[PDB]
Structures are given as structure tokens and as C-alpha cells.
């Protein structure tokens, strides 16, 4: 076996391939997807070629997938032409495919063996791709607000119906390609007016193309219009039905005036028509379908039940557009609708489908000069004389009734990018490699050894694990190597002291309950310079016992560190089976810096290398011995208990009628190969002393001189009488009446020393004559 530098792999695939999009130079290609994915965002307007190079977004040597390469993409330009590598790949006999939007991935990684995802792309158009040249081109442009997802909202560009139709009969590219001379210009200017000052826009398509006339029958729909030829001319026009009339300057209709009957007397009781209209429409931004209620509440609150209609006006882009539309539909077809078919002697003769006029037969009919829209008309022959009017009640323009945006949730929360989180990191110790390590290999790790671990906190649900970037001593860059699963973290808050046992905190984290009774955690405090080292920064391993909700009960001192005191707001870090390196035999003294970057599904990795760092000091490996325990001391006559954070005095006489105090202190043998994966808590007994191990004594003075040093002591306590400390922690000497000695402690075994030490202080006091 072998690390993952050489190992089987996820397969990469290695071939490319070419997508043909669709017809006609485009203005602008913006955004490429991948699965239901935004993979890569950038206006693409000519022949060019990019990139796509964030992998990330799938996976990559922790995950499946993950989209990179190059990507060529031709517009069809008129006279394009494509590199040949496109032809080679392709192969032989090969065109330039000019007038047709083809994209070129030639990166490798077209997917993951897995098999390859479906891809999606966006673009709009105005004036590219226009047989024989653009038309009226200064209105094609309707932009407007239609977002999907609240805070993610953008407006989109629209384009002007009115040139959607002009294209449709001034293209020979598809249909009838109708030439412009035959086309009423000025009728399609008079689309625009309106089609652009209401900001009317459409965004439809044509796949598995069918009829034009059907295709024009639903342009027609959406905008509200008719087509038609111009009586004089005979070029083909467009007309928009709209509020275009004065109500004064209509001509009025009766009997005395061109009328010659109403073809149509009855009422049909058209009292129960349509009250309720459901538009149903596509936000491209969404790129799928959207609906509208439209409720015409005085029908509803008279008539009863319900008259609905569920009309289609898919390609309509936004809400306000599609309440335009629904407010039309249902005002035109739901208020008062009349037909009326009308003879007409030669008073009309001019009058043309669409056009407007009032018809007054008060009476005989008893209508009230009412305004009227035609529509059908059938012009007569030289015989006969009459034109028979087809004819519909007032229709409508667009205006604002309702408030129908829904506004959506911006995609609920759908973030999962990654972010800097809290991490620890210190030197691996024996536990850690007895827990981790097999034992096939756990011998033969000779002293020189060291390994490197760590723990974080996890910032985002989205996040998975993390990635440890390590640049030790001669390498260039933090280099990726091993990978940590995110521990459970605990936030002290009660400043618990050196013996303290029931332990308060608080930032329960979701896997902080994850731990068995009697499992191993590793206090620590803010690191920086200074703070760096862990001889004097309290790192404790502390064995938890047993939960008590916010609170858990757990020991002090177990493993690798004599127990220490706290303040709140500190970290606590739970390291059982949990932790993250390299594996790699870091000599002594070799430091290295250290990043840990955190890593999401389709995020991928945090920031290449803008993550934080922390230097970490090989000055300590795993093969020290362990330090005593239930270090005690006490003097003559308070010989009974005396912790080294509780000073004993040594004054010149220990009692009346008795000699100079002696400052006793005692420890306990612990073996640290004997002791395994179990953590005998500071508190507890001797286990043991390893094989040959020794301890170890320093005595610093009030002026923190080093004064003596002591060494090769295999016993569990030492002695320090009055008169023996005087010789170097001298009364005559200091000034001051009570000399306050530092005394501190450890234990060695083949020549180096424990990792920490105990400190403990005594006082000696001089006397008079």
C-alpha cells in the first residue's frame, strides 16, 4: 500500500465535444450550465474563446465530476471560420458552419467516468443575424425587470414583438421571407409605439418548429393584434388592438346615416360570461413556468360559482407583464361583451377590420350610442351595394389592477460555498498514534518521530471535510496533503481552575454529544507569538466522563499534560478518533507552517491558498515519558496535603522546639507505554514509571535565576530543608525577609524531557540574632 500520491483514482475522461446551439449570430452568449448548475458566467459577443476552469463545482480528487477547459465557441458569423483543430477532431471532410451558433469544448474533461451531465446555455439577440440587415433597430431593445429570486434580481432583455414579426415575413432563413417593399413599415413602427412605451416584450421560442401562421397566431395572442394587408397598397401590416379612440371624433351610426340593419337584435342573457382568468407564463431567469390568478371580484360576488379559464402565454417573461396580459383578457372578455352584425350601404367603405365606430338605434332597439370595434367585413360586389360589419364590443389596452408579484425566496437558502472557520492545530501526541496507528507498524517508530494533527470547526452545513495545506521547511507552497474530519468543539465560559471537574460551557456543537463516556478531550487557549508554545500555553487532555447537558463532567491532566486553569470564551476541542494529518515522520525541530481549508460539495475547496495560518514548532515529539502524578507536597507540620499551585512556607523553624522547616513533596510513577490509550487522570495514582525514566528538578529563585538543577531522581518525592535550600536559594543573599523560590519539576528518560513541567514556589525566611 501506498499514500494516495500513487493509488487507483476516480478515472478522469480525456475527450471533448461539439454542440450545435442553434441558428443566426447572436448579440451576446451570457451564462453556461451543467446539470441544473450555474457553472460559468461571461458575454461572449463574436468568435472568441474562453475557458471554464472552476472543477469545483462538482468534485474533482475528493469528488465526482467537475467541468475544465478550454471552450471555442463560433456565432456563425457570415463569413466564419472555425480552427481546424475542430475539423481534425470532427475529422475529415468538415464545413465551417456559418450562420449557426456552435460551441467547441475542447477541454478534457468533458465529465467524470460517471456518466456525462446534461448542459444548459443562455443568449438574446437584437440586431445579429438579420437576412438582408436589421429593421427600426433603435426599438428592438425591450429591457425589463423580470427577476426570479428577490435578492438575486436582474433585469432581462426583451425583445420588441413588433420585430419579432417583421423578421417572421423579412427572412428568408425560415418561412416565408416575405421582402421588406411588400412589408407596411409604417404599421410596424406603429407596433413599436406602443410595444415599447408599455414595455411589451417576449421571450418565446420554436423548437420543433411548426405552421408560421400558427407561430404568428400565438405572437398575434400575446401582443393582442391582427395582421392584415393594407387596402391600397397591399403590402402585408400589423395592427395592435388597443384603447386607440377619442370617443368624439367617432363617426355615429343610424338609420339616417349609413345604416341599414342590425343583422344582430338578440340577447343571448350574456350575463354569466368568463370571471376568472389563470395566466400561465415563462420567466426565462427561472427558465420555466409561472402562473397568475386574476379574479374579476364583482362577477364573483354576484354570480356565484366560478366561470374560470386557464389561457397559455408561455414566453411573456415576468409578473407585471403577465398581470398586463391577464387584466386585458379578463376586462375585454368578462365586461358587458356584445356582438353586433351590421348592414351597410357604401358609408363604410373605407372602414377596415379593427377600425372604431358608434352605432345609435334608440328607436327601435333603444341601445344607447354605444362604441363599438369591427372586425369581420365583407366587402360587396358592384351589385348589391351593402358591407356587411362584423362588429365586437370596446376592447381594452393593458393597465394595473393587481399586485401579483410573487416575489420568490431568492432559491431558499440554496448557498453552500465555503468559509474560514476557528481551527487548533499541536503536535500528535503517543495517543494519538496508539489510537490511529496499527500496531503492526506502531513499533519500529523510533523517537525521532513526529506527527502533526489538528482540529476546526465546521462553518457551513454544506461543508463535508477538510483539507490540510502543510509547507514544511524547503517546500515551496503549502502543499495538500491528508484531510481531517471536522471534531467536536466546545467554547469554555466558567474560568475553571487547575482542579476543577465539572465543566461548564456553552456552543454545543452538533457533534459535541457525539462523545462516549470516558473519551479524551484536548483543552487549548489563543495561540500567537509567544503563545505559540505549549510548555507554558495550557494544553491540557482532559478524559470526559459523563454529559450533563451545556455542562459535562470530565477529568484533568489524563494523558500528556499536567491540568491547568482557564478563562471563559476559550476553545475546547474533543480529539477522540477524530483529527486530521499527513501520516508523514516529521523529525524533531523540523516546524512547519500549516493552512486547513475547508471544502463543500459544489463549492468545492476554500480559497486556493487565502486561508489563514499557523506556525507549528516540532521542538517536542511523541517519545518523551510522561510526567508524575497527584503531584503533593507539605511541610513539618502541615505535612498532609499541599498542591503545587498552593505554596508551603519554609521558615527558619518549623515549630517551637522544632528544626528548620523541610518542604516535602511527592509524585507519583506513571508508565506512558503501560498506560496505552487509557488516560489516568492526574488525579489518579502511580501506574508505574517507565523502564530507566528519572526525574527531574529546577529551582528558579526570586530573581528567576536558574539556581541549581537536579537529576536522576527514581523517587516519588524529594525534600527540601531549610537549611538545603539556603545553600542556593540563599537568605542571606536576597534582601527581602521571605525569599519566594520558584520551584519547578519534570521527568526525563533517555536524556530528553517531558513536554511540560509543575511549578511550585516556597518561601524562606530568615531569622534574627
Same mark, same amino acid.
Given at each position: ?86 475539423? @481534425? ?89 416575405? =421582402? ?38 400565438? %405572437? ?79 362577477? %364573483? ?102 399586485? @401579483? ?242 505554596? =508551603? ?84 543573599? =536576597? ?18 524531557? =517531558? ?15
Amino acid at each position: 500500500g501506498s499514500k494516495s500520491k500513487k493509488v487507483t483514482v476516480g478515472y478522469k475522461y480525456y475527450m471533448g465535444l461539439f454542440m450545435g446551439l442553434f441558428r443566426g449570430p447572436v448579440n451576446e452568449i451570457t451564462e453556461i450550465r451543467v446539470g441544473d448548475r450555474t457553472a460559468w458566467t461571461g458575454s461572449i459577443t463574436g468568435n472568441t474563446t474562453i475557458q471554464i476552469n472552476k472543477e469545483s463545482l462538482f468534485g474533482g480528487t475528493k469528488a465526482e465530476g467537475g467541468i475544465d477547459g478550454p471552450l471555442e465557441v463560433y456565432m456563425g458569423a457570415p463569413t466564419q471560420t472555425v480552427s481546424q483543430k475542430l475539423k @481534425n477532431m470532427l475529422g475529415g471532410r468538415q464545413p465551417e458552419f456559418r450562420g449557426v451558433v456552435t460551441a467547441y469544448f475542447d477541454g478534457l474533461i468533458c465529465a467524470m467516468n460517471p456518466y456525462p451531465k446534461q448542459w444548459k446555455f443562455k443568449a438574446r439577440r437584437s440586431t445579429a443575424g438579420w437576412t438582408g440587415g436589421v429593421w427600426y433597430p433603435e426599438k428592438c431593445l425591450v429591457k425589463m425587470q423580470g427577476y426570479d429570486g428577490q435578492g438575486n434580481q436582474h433585469e432581462i432583455h426583451a425583445m420588441n414583438p413588433a420585430h419579432i414579426l417583421y423578421e417572421c415575413q423579412s427572412n428568408y432563413e425560415w418561412g416565408r421571407g416575405l =421582402s421588406r417593399t411588400l412589408i407596411d413599415d409604417t404599421t410596424f413602427r406603429l407596433a413599436a409605439d406602443t410595444l415599447f412605451n408599455e414595455n411589451f416584450g417576449l421571450c418565446i421560442r420554436w423548437n420543433r418548429q411548426d405552421t408560421l401562421e400558427s407561430f404568428m397566431q400565438l %405572437i398575434l395572442d400575446h401582443i393582442g393584434g391582427a395582421m392584415y394587408v393594407s387596402k391600397v397598397t397591399g403590402k402585408l401590416s400589423l395592427r395592435l388592438i388597443r384603447k386607440d379612440y377619442d370617443f368624439d371624433t367617432l363617426p355615429i351610426f343610424d338609420t339616417d346615416s349609413g345604416l341599414l340593419s342590425i343583422q344582430e337584435a338578440t340577447n343571448a342573457s350574456p350575463a354569466n360570461l368568463v370571471n376568472e382568468v389563470v395566466v400561465t407564463y415563462h420567466n426565462p431567469v427561472m427558465d420555466e413556468d409561472q402562473q397568475v390568478r386574476s379574479h374579476n371580484l364583482a362577477q %364573483i360576488q354576484n354570480q356565484g360559482c366560478l366561470n374560470s379559464n386557464t389561457i397559455e402565454y408561455l414566453g411573456i417573461p415576468t409578473g407585471k407583464l403577465a398581470m398586463q396580459v391577464a387584466q386585458r383578457d379578463l376586462r375585454a372578455a368578462s365586461t358587458n361583451v356584445r356582438r353586433f352584425t351590421v348592414i351597410c350601404d357604401r358609408r363604410a367603405w373605407n372602414v377596415q377590420p379593427g377600425d372604431v365606430l358608434k352605432v345609435r338605434d334608440p328607436k327601435q332597439r333603444g341601445l344607447t350610442e354605444v362604441v363599438i370595434r369591427v372586425g369581420t367585413v365583407e366587402d360587396g360586389t358592384l351589385p348589391d351595394g351593402k358591407i356587411k360589419v362584423v362588429a365586437l364590443q370596446d376592447q381594452f389596452a393593458f393597465q394595473l389592477n393587481t399586485f @401579483n408579484q410573487v416575489e420568490p425566496p431568492a432559491g431558499y437558502e440554496p448557498n453552500l460555498t465555503p468559509a474560514i472557520a476557528r481551527r487548533i492545530v499541536y503536535e500528535m501526541p503517543y495517543v494519538d498514534l496508539v489510537q490511529q496507528l496499527p500496531d503492526g507498524e506502531l513499533n519500529a517508530v523510533g523517537p525521532n518521530d513526529a506527527f502533526i494533527n489538528s482540529q476546526a470547526e465546521k462553518p457551513t452545513d454544506m461543508s463535508a471535510a477538510y483539507d490540510m495545506g502543510i509547507m514544511a521547511e524547503g517546500e515551496s507552497g503549502f502543499d495538500v496533503r491528508g484531510n481531517g474530519d471536522f471534531g467536536a468543539f466546545g467554547s469554555l465560559a466558567s474560568d475553571i481552575d487547575y482542579l476543577s471537574t465539572q465543566i461548564v460551557l456553552s456552543e454545543m456543537t452538533d457533534m459535541w454529544d457525539d462523545v462516549q463516556p470516558g473519551f479524551v478531550a484536548r483543552i487549548a487557549k489563543p495561540v500567537l507569538d509567544g503563545q505559540r508554545t505549549q510548555m507554558e500555553i495550557a494544553e491540557e487532555f482532559v478524559r470526559i466522563d459523563a454529559i450533563n447537558g451545556n455542562v459535562i463532567t470530565v477529568a484533568r491532566g489524563v494523558l500528556d499534560t499536567i491540568p491547568f486553569r482557564h478563562q471563559k470564551s476559550e476553545m475546547l476541542w474533543v480529539t477522540t478518533y477524530d483529527g486530521g494529518t499527513d501520516w508523514q515522520k516529521y523529525a524533531g525541530n523540523e516546524s512547519i507552517d500549516i493552512k486547513i481549508l475547508p471544502w463543500t460539495l459544489g463549492g468545492g475547496r476554500f480559497p486556493i491558498e487565502d486561508a489563514p495560518i499557523d506556525h507549528l514548532d516540532m521542538d517536542f515529539r511523541q517519545i518523551r515519558p510522561y510526567p508524575p502524578g497527584n503531584v503533593q507536597h507539605y511541610l513539618a507540620s502541615t505535612s498532609t496535603l499541599q498542591r503545587w499551585y498552593v505554596p =508551603s512556607a519554609l521558615t527558619y523553624t518549623a515549630n517551637a522546639g522544632e528544626t528548620p522547616d523541610t518542604y516535602t513533596l511527592t509524585w507519583a510513577h506513571r508508565d506512558r507505554v503501560l498506560q496505552g490509550d487509557k488516560p489516568v487522570p492526574h488525579i489518579d495514582g502511580d501506574i508505574g514509571p517507565e523502564p530507566g525514566t528519572s526525574y527531574t528538578i529546577r529551582v528558579y529563585n526570586q530573581e528567576g535565576t536558574l539556581v541549581r538543577t537536579e537529576s536522576g531522581i527514581n523517587g516519588t518525592t524529594w525534600n527540601w530543608p531549610y537549611a538545603t535550600a539556603a545553600a542556593d536559594m540563599n537568605v542571606e543573599a =536576597s534582601l527581602f525577609d521571605p525569599v519566594l523560590a520558584t520551584l519547578r519539576l519534570t521527568s526525563a528518560r533517555n536524556g530528553r524531557e =517531558s513536554w511540560e513541567y509543575y511549578e511550585m514556589k516556597v518561601s524562606v525566611y530568615k531569622k534574627p540574632p
